């Protein structure tokens, strides 16, 4: 069951690269992409990804983070 | 063993959202045996490692690919479904 | 690819090492997106701006495992 998760993150390229590396390091992730006109959203695609743990980790290490999409 | 792109499974690809969607699928063979496959643009060019060599591969408007491939190797293209 | 962005594809020896390679590439300045692709899911495709592919190869080799540049477009 292939998943797509879109997360909006507070990026206050420091926070962006840090956010991207964190997500990319997560188990089950096949792809990560920085999107939005403000380049403040990350699209993650993979299998077996836990979005709750991912949000918790972004909030702890990068900044506030919100789930926009899970499909 | 012959090549038949109408029966090849689609590549494992990712349409990066920050760039236009590429119009073509490419398939690389050695002795007519599939080695890998991916996406590429039409009416464009890329440098690709094909066996031992770096090969400059040009694509036309119909996803036909041309290049100087090493002996035994070929890269062939076709249009993706919506293109 | 057409436009301002670069696409590069790197094969990495990955057997832990998968997440490490992805994280390294994703942390690189100028990166917009990174994906694991290919028939053997052993190739990383990177899109962005101002990325030096040869420096990326050297960094992957130092930190992760062998790495080979396979496409620039």
Author numbering:
A (entry chain A): 187 to 198, 200 to 258
B (entry chain C): 31 to 113
C (entry chain B): 184 to 198, 201 to 258
Describing publication, verbatim:
NLRs are a conserved component of plants' innate immune systems and survey the host environment for perturbations caused by invading pathogens. Intriguingly, the NLR pair Pik-1/Pik-2, which recognises AVR-Pik, also binds the effector via an HMA domain but this domain is integrated between the CC and NB-ARC regions of Pik-1. The integrated HMA domains of RGA5 and Pik-1 appear to have evolved from a family of rice proteins that only contain the HMA domain. Each of the Pikp-HMA monomers adopts the HMA-domain fold (Pfam: PF00403), comprising a four-stranded antiparallel β-sheet and two α-helices packed in an α/β sandwich.
However, following a co-expression strategy with 6xHis tagged Pikp-HMA and untagged AVR-PikD (see ‘Materials and methods’), we obtained crystals of this complex in multiple conditions. Optimisation of one of these conditions produced crystals diffracting X-rays to 1.6 Å resolution. The structure of the Pikp-HMA/AVR-PikD complex reveals an intimate interface formed between these proteins that buries 18.7% of the effector's solvent accessible surface area (1031.0 Å2). The majority of the interaction is formed with a monomer of Pikp-HMA, with 87.5% of the effector's buried surface area (902.2 Å2) and nine residues contributing hydrogen bond and/or salt bridge interactions. This suggests that the AVR-PikD/Pikp-HMA monomer interaction most likely represents the biologically significant interface. AVR-PikD adopts a six-stranded β-sandwich structure, stabilised by a di-sulphide bond between Cys54 and Cys70. Three primary sites of interaction are apparent between Pikp-HMA and AVR-PikD. The first is dominated by main-chain hydrogen bonding between the C-terminal β-stand of Pikp-HMA and β3 of AVR-PikD, which results in formation of a continuous antiparallel β-sheet comprising the four β-strands of Pikp-HMA and β3–5 of AVR-PikD. The second involves the side chain of Pikp-HMAAsp224, which forms a salt–bridge interaction with the side chain of AVR-PikDArg64, and is also held in place by a hydrogen bond of its main chain NH group to the side chain of AVR-PikDAsp66. AVR-PikDHis46 is bound in a pocket on Pikp-HMA via hydrogen bonds/salt bridge interactions between AVR-PikDHis46:Nδ1/Pikp-HMASer218:Oγ and AVR-PikDHis46:Nε2/Pikp-HMAGlu230:Oε1; also, Pikp-HMAVal232 packs on top of the AVR-PikDHis46 ring and contributes hydrophobic/van der Waals interactions.
